[PDB]
Amino acid sequence: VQTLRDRARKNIQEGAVTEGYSADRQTVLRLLNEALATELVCFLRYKRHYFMATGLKASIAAAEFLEHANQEMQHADQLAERIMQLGGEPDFNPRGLEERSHAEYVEGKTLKDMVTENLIAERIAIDSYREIITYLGNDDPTTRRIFEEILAQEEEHADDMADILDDLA
Amino acid sequence: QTLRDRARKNIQEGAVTEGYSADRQTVLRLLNEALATELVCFLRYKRHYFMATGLKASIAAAEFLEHANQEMQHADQLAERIMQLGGEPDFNPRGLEERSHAEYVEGKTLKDMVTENLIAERIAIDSYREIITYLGNDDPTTRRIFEEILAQEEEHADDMADILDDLA
Amino acid sequence: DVQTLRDRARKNIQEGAVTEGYSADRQTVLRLLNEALATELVCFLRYKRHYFMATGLKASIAAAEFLEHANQEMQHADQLAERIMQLGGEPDFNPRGLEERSHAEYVEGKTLKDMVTENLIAERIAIDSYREIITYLGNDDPTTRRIFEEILAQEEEHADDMADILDDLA
Amino acid sequence: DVQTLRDRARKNIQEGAVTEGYSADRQTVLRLLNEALATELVCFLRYKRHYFMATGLKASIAAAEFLEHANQEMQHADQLAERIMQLGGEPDFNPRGLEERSHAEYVEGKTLKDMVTENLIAERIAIDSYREIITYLGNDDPTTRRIFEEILAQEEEHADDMADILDDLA
Amino acid sequence: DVQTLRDRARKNIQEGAVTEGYSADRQTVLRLLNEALATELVCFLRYKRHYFMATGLKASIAAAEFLEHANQEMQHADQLAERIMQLGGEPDFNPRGLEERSHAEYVEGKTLKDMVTENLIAERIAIDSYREIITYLGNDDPTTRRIFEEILAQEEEHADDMADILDDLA
Amino acid sequence: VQTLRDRARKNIQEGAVTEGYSADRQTVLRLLNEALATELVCFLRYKRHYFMATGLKASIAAAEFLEHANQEMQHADQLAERIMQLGGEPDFNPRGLEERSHAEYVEGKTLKDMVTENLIAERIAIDSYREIITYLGNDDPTTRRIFEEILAQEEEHADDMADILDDLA
Amino acid sequence: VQTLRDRARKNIQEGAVTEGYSADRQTVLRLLNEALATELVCFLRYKRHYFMATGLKASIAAAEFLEHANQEMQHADQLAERIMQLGGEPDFNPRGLEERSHAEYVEGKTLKDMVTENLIAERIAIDSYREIITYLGNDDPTTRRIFEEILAQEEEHADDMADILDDLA
Amino acid sequence: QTLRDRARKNIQEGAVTEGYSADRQTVLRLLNEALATELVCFLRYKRHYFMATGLKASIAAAEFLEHANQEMQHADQLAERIMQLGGEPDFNPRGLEERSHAEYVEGKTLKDMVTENLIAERIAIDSYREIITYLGNDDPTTRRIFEEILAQEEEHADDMADILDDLA
Amino acid sequence: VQTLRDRARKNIQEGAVTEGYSADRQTVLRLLNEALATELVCFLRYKRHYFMATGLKASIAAAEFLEHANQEMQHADQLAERIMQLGGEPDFNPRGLEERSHAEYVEGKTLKDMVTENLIAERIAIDSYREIITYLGNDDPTTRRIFEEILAQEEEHADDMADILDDLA
Amino acid sequence: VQTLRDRARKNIQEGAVTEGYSADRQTVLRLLNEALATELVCFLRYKRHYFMATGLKASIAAAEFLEHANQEMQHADQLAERIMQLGGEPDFNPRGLEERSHAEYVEGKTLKDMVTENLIAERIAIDSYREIITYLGNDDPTTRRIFEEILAQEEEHADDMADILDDLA
Amino acid sequence: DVQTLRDRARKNIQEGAVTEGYSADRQTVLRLLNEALATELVCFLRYKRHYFMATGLKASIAAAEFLEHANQEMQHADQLAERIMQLGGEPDFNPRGLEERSHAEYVEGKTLKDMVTENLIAERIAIDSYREIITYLGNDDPTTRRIFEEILAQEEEHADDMADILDDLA
Amino acid sequence: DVQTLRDRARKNIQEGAVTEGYSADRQTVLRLLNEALATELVCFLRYKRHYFMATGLKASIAAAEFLEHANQEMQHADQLAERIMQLGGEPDFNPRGLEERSHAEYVEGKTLKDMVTENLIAERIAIDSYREIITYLGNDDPTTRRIFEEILAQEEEHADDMADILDDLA
Ligand SMILES: [Fe+2]
Ligand SMILES: [Fe+2]
Ligand SMILES: [Fe+2]
Ligand SMILES: [Fe+2]
Ligand SMILES: [Fe+2]
Ligand SMILES: [Fe+2]
Ligand SMILES: [Fe+2]
Ligand SMILES: [Fe+2]
Ligand SMILES: [Fe+2]
Ligand SMILES: [Fe+2]
Ligand SMILES: [Fe+2]
Ligand SMILES: [Fe+2]
Ligand SMILES: [Fe+2]
Ligand SMILES: [Fe+2]
Ligand SMILES: [Fe+2]
Ligand SMILES: [Fe+2]
Ligand SMILES: [Fe+2]
């Protein structure tokens, strides 16, 4: 009626966040920024491994590392965009990046080191994003779908790294 | 051969099988209302697109056109689903606004246009959230349409608010 | 805090995508994925048959739909097989017993109305079969659920497509 | 002789494309453009309705034409709306009273022959309307005339397309 | 007003693009289109002949032009044939009597200067021929007029191209 | 050695036609020109049918007709180019085109007429080109391959047209 | 049809200009070269404004400036090509370029200066080309269509510049 | 007009004219056996593609997929020829292997997979050489299909042998 | 003869670094890693500003911000690759990134803040890379050319940001 | 350090021109505008020759003429953009264009005239830009690289024109 | 018989494409392939030399043909080298003795007519060499035969191209 | 000022890109360009040999680099040859004495490590050779110097690529 229009007019500057938004906006924003930090850390680690993984066999892994690195940055972009829509600020500050994150930057010494560290990070991300998807439930479909999409990519990343690690003894 | 006999019965219903657990007639009503809403928002954005002239306004005018054509994609997604679920998609311009959750509003200033669009996006968001809830797990294919459309409307609302915040 | 998340991930690391938080029945999900895989392969072969045999002016319009659907069935086959690998299984492409593993049948058909009906029946079998899998999965495995949800939507489109044709044949 | 051309351009400069030499009846040309815009919007909506409803083997062939035509009608709408702006008017996309502003009607039709005939009628109404407008414009407004000359040619093609279909139905 | 436009469109609906307002001599416009169609087909064959026979360094430059023109002539042929159908005629592609229906001749030529000159003659025959048709049409048939206006401009470009070559051939 | 070069020097203007060209060059040239005329006739017939085959079912045929028309012209170009290589002249004269040809231009009144006339022409070309391929044998691989390629297309055209004709009545 | 052929043979070197060309070839060439000069001047003005229109709002104008500049050069090419067809010489001499044209090169100091000067040139061009289109009448369809097509672009340019100027003050 | 009467007789037979000197029935049998071989080889390679994981094995897995899709191109090429010659292409998975000249073999190691593919390629090479001989000059269009497929199978055999030489 | 080959064969594993490499490789490597840290910091700042610069005018700046961000990452890749070729390790560690860098991550509160911080960072890099180009001289053309190319891009970035800043006040 | 930052803040609006800019900005700007005049003049000459060079043989030269014309315009844009970065104004005024230039607009009567006049202009530019490259030295790498790149293009143009002229007589 | 086909394939499996059914003289076919490979490389170097040296308006036309042909020669070289590997040989790219292994010569030429003739001579040498190789192969090796047949047809085109140029040179 | 620049350009006009201001030793630069051209052609031939012979899973990875490098070498060859023409020389593509003109050798290699090492040696020979030429050129010839600076940078990348491979080979 004229109430639908009045409901939309109230707090109009809140944009995507309407009166019917039933999630905890503050908490979803916290989770998005933690994921953002995790993605940025994983981007830097993978790029490091990409340049360092030289040699015939190792170059195959280096290709995966770079492919993954840029996919992590796409995840960062998806998350940063949602942070803006939900009224937050995406934190790209390198200071304290690792502490905000669920991941660590680990140089590694050998190819086995690099492959394992990426595999651990992918598995940390998988379980962490599964839990967020549960927390969101039906309160925020748009954010849930972002994590659902990122999750499937992280599961592919973990499968990719495990397939390599199995040949590395 | 029991699976085959279920599919063999009422074969002409096509996508709608013995396992379709939603209230098909109601889903069809909701789909047509959404279709009317998308067509109205398409016409509004096209109006604003042509009228938003000037340096700043041309920036909004680009968004207006981008959004207009996205609204029509949603209309197509909804009309296609109406056909699959055994209904008829209503493109009749008569009573279009009354079928709709949105209004066609010309606006006089850019702030008028931007606000009217923002109001429409926020109305659609809450409507599609409710439909998504009503569907539940009874119709994944239709639910996913509204979830995909919903996400776009949330982006449109963010886009329009980002503009409105600087206009005054 | 950081070392508990990390210690959960280090345990059974070779399991890859399957983490400690994976709450589905990995063994059963794998069985369902391979049944769907067999179904997609069977439907791919039927549609390719119908594509080549559906000659004539009107039938060539159906023949196009048949080929489009065939290649979509193979995309579904690849999608399911990739998930089978991620969950630690082996995707079964063996043509022996392919039909018995499947939810659908290869049926040559004699007339175009036969071909359209057999395809329409298969689509409707897949729709209800995959709806049940989506229900079985619940919230335990979003990634697999999303595969079936996407395939389901395509089968509903295929069923509508075949039904739209069948209504004009008699 | 240089500062008179320049002074002619300075007078009423905000009028833009409409120069001192514009010899047409701007107010009337604007009315004709908005009537055409309403007609294109109605024809767009009719064709989209027919596109979705024309299912079956033969009908899918018409449905392709229906969609092709629908989107061409929207291009005509855009061309007309852009010219309305250049000539200092406002393009009216309001769905209220759309049909009364228009030379065409939204007609659902029940059968394919209904849909094809209704489209054919609309195309032929547009052809004679735009012929008259082109005559009314004459040499007073080449730019607007060329828009209608371009749209007319497309509408003649639409009419040929629909008649070709109708000849096999009836 | 609403129902007289519609009654006018409904009458003789099968005539398609040709509405009650079509003021040209449909029978004669069709005769002119088929003559032009024959000319384009003849000119296509001449240019292709010259394309294959014009070998050598210098000649290959002309041969490229011959081929470009050959295919532009065929585009004009299709363009005319499509309008013939819209106006209710039949486009005559019969090679029998093709040359006699035409305004041009197939002339093999022995030298490059022969080939260039014969093409230049045909271009100049078409230019004046299509100028006369454009005048005959006047405002009675904008859509057909624009076809000849567009073809004419291409033919004037063809004549310029051939003349530029002939000037070096002495 | 120095004879290989001396064989190439002799009659150098004959170009592709070397001392080893063992076929009956004048006869091959006649066959190429007869085929060239056949393709031009088939091009004109199909283009006629393309424009005249209007209506719902018939428009499906019209698409095949146009597709075929342009393939016939590719064959024409292929043959005319080979005529040049073998020292002849490609004859595009519309006068007597039909008499030089193995096929006829036939307008047809019904769609069944058009489809049948095309089907008859395709089957004529098939047998003509089969015989030419046999006649050439190994004496002229380059020309043989042109006919082998054209033949394969004509067999497809015949299959296409017969498939249509079977449901027309 | 032996008179048509002899008509074409007479004065064959004149090319596109046939015995039936009813316009004043000499004057049309004069009008085309004036138009060519206008297009070249407007090209130079717009390129100047493009480089000088820096800033947030102004960069929006700068895009239109560059878009228009290259559209002006396309018009210059159309006119030059037609000059050749009608037997003239296209004059690209920068010396006296401004005196030959209907428009001026004006640097402008502010953005409002630049926009106003472009709008003035567009409206001068619009009325000049309207007159040429009338002068040509039915004597030269091909040249008329060139000016008709250019005219329509100038009306778009005038609308584009007016829409900007209305917001500047 | 005698050529025309020759073409009119048995017109519905399409591509198969009076001059068709091959044994149409036998050529059709061979095409369908080849079609079965291509389908089996498609399924084997697809299995190997998904199962060949690891650093080295992924290199083989790429070849496996490339070949898999080339096999399906051959399948289509053969099926279309079956239609032109008036037969029916048999895609039924029942008895597919018995109709085929090749086997589906899962393999346990990468060397097993590579070896099984190499065996299948060498079986096809010799099968298609014999068919090319049988056809002779009786059916150029069919012969050329086998000649094209043959060259691809020879490429496949070289690719697989090149892998196998380094595995042990 | 064999002196060219024996010279190349000595210390072969050093790869791109031949006997003729006359630069101070360890120092060049230090400069390369400092620049890499600068590029990553500038990447993160620009991405922050890109997401935060909302509104009609600011969205124009946001586009420049994103364009620049990705060019900064291209520079990072270019430097990291040269680090590898010259026998070092590229440091992507986010800990202490800002201290290894010549630039700072600064969120900024206003658009003028963001633009000014970016302009300051661009001008720091310009002078820094000019000095490196001088330090390199003719001893290492390949590395010199990398900084020359980056410098030219940074000079464009400084002009871009300065052009925005004049309209901001 | 914070002096590095303060150095960037001093005269911040000067953008690409930093405190370390050691060239004579005023003179580099004068040289850039002269070259801009040269490129515009050479653009106009080549366009004239392009339209006027008709005939079989001449059409080959006409193609080179147009290719070069558009390459000259690219140089023009490249120089004009650098003029902006260094704080000047690019002068596109057609008035006095030729006097500001190092080249002349020359219509030429024969094809040999056109080729010769173009060849002369190319060789004037080659020596002119070599001197500018020397004057710049190490003071302005970014500008030096622009002239170095343009120079290479002009040397290619000279070789192209000489190759034509050698066969013309 | 399913295990004899398999046993034939298993015997000498490392020979790859070379099966028990390979009826040609593998050693001799490899010799001929390497001779052709040398011929193609020499012809590549000749054409590249001619491409750079053929300056002037008329000559620039020839230079384009020279470059196109040069790169087509390199495709032939690759095509032959790939077949050499498949048949179990080693492709010899050694510049030492390249000319002695080849059927053609590297000839700089002084005039354009020199360059064209030398290329024309080389094309005609290859034509007769490859016709003989095609005959020698007969039905023993279809895959290799088809390589020479495809290369041959290109060489026949190259010869026509050079002769067409030479005829106008004097 | 105007007519002196013009007179300087007019003197020795046929020398083209080489103006009075060319301060390098043109004869010597031409010698160095031709030596480099020989090196690039030899390196092209070596890498092509290695590309075809490096079979196997790991080696196929090297084979890709080998082919990528081979074709980059040919780009360098063309870049150098074009500059030879501009400076008034003739690029020598003669395979006779090619190796003696070159700074590198064609080496077949027996193992993959052999192939990788020979390429690595060649890259390092080229790297120091082109650094010296860049120094010899100084500021006398920017256009040629930039060619060598660009080629050098590619060779440093090639050397790094080959070294990266060699470390894992043993
Ligand atoms: Fe991620
Ligand atoms: Fe990941
Ligand atoms: Fe929407
Ligand atoms: Fe929306
Ligand atoms: Fe499926
Ligand atoms: Fe319309
Ligand atoms: Fe219409
Ligand atoms: Fe024409
Ligand atoms: Fe044909
Ligand atoms: Fe055919
Ligand atoms: Fe303009
Ligand atoms: Fe196969
Ligand atoms: Fe195979
Ligand atoms: Fe920067
Ligand atoms: Fe230049
Ligand atoms: Fe050749
Ligand atoms: Fe190189």
Author numbering:
A (entry chain G), F (entry chain H), G (entry chain I), I (entry chain J), J (entry chain L): 9 to 177
B (entry chain A), H (entry chain C): 10 to 177
C (entry chain B), D (entry chain F), E (entry chain E), K (entry chain D), L (entry chain K): 8 to 177
What text does the study give?
We report the biochemical, structural, and functional characterization of the protein coded by gene PA4880 in the P. aeruginosa PAO1 genome. Our structural work shows that the product of gene PA4880 is a protein that adopts the Dps subunit fold, which oligomerizes into a 12-mer quaternary structure. Unlike Dps, however, the ferroxidase di-iron centers and iron coordinating ligands are buried within each subunit, in a manner identical to that observed in the ferroxidase center of P. aeruginosa bacterioferritin. The ferroxidase centers in Pa DpsL catalyze the oxidation of Fe2+ utilizing O2 or H2O2 as oxidant, and the resultant Fe3+ is compartmentalized in the interior cavity.
Prismatic crystals were also obtained from the Salt RxHT screen condition G2 (1 M MgSO4, 100 mM Bis-Tris pH 7.0). Structure solution and refinement produced the model termed Pa DpsL-dd-Mg (3.0 Å resolution), which contains 44 sulfate ions, 24 Fe ions, and 37 Mg ions. The locations of the Mg2+ ions were identified by analyzing the Fo-Fc difference electron density following refinement and by computing a Fo-Fo electron density difference map to compare the differences between the DpsL-dd-Mg and DpsL-dd data sets. Except for the presence of Mg2+, the structural features observed in the Pa DpsL-dd-Mg are nearly identical to those observed in the Pa DpsL-dd structure. A network of Mg2+ and SO4 2- ions are observed in the structures of 12-mer Pa DpsL (Pa DpsL-dd and Pa DpsL-dd-Mg). Four distinct SO4 2- and three unique Mg2+ binding sites have been observed. Both types of ions can be visualized in the Pa DpsL-dd-Mg structure The SO4 2- binding sites can be observed in sites 1–4. Two Mg2+ ions (Mg site 1) are in proximity to sulfate site 2, where each of the cations is coordinated by the side chain of Glu 106, which stems from each of the one-turn α3 helices. Mg site 2 is near the protein surface where it is coordinated by the side chains of Asp 167 and Asp 171 in the C-terminal helix (α5), whereas Mg site 3 is in the 12-mer interior, where it is coordinated by the side chains of Asp164, Asp168 in the C-terminal helix and Glu 72 and Glu75 in helix α2. This extensive network of Mg2+ and SO4 2- ions coordinated to 12-mer DpsL suggest that the nature of the stabilizing effect that Mg2+ and SO4 2- have on the DpsL dodecamer structure originate from the mediation of otherwise repulsive electrostatic interactions that would take place among positively charged residues in the three-fold pores, or among the high density of negative charge concentrated near the C-terminus. Hence, in the absence of Mg2+ and SO4 2-, one can envision significant folding-unfolding transitions affecting secondary, tertiary, and quaternary structure, which largely destabilize not only the 12-mer structure but also lead to proteolysis of the N-terminal domain.
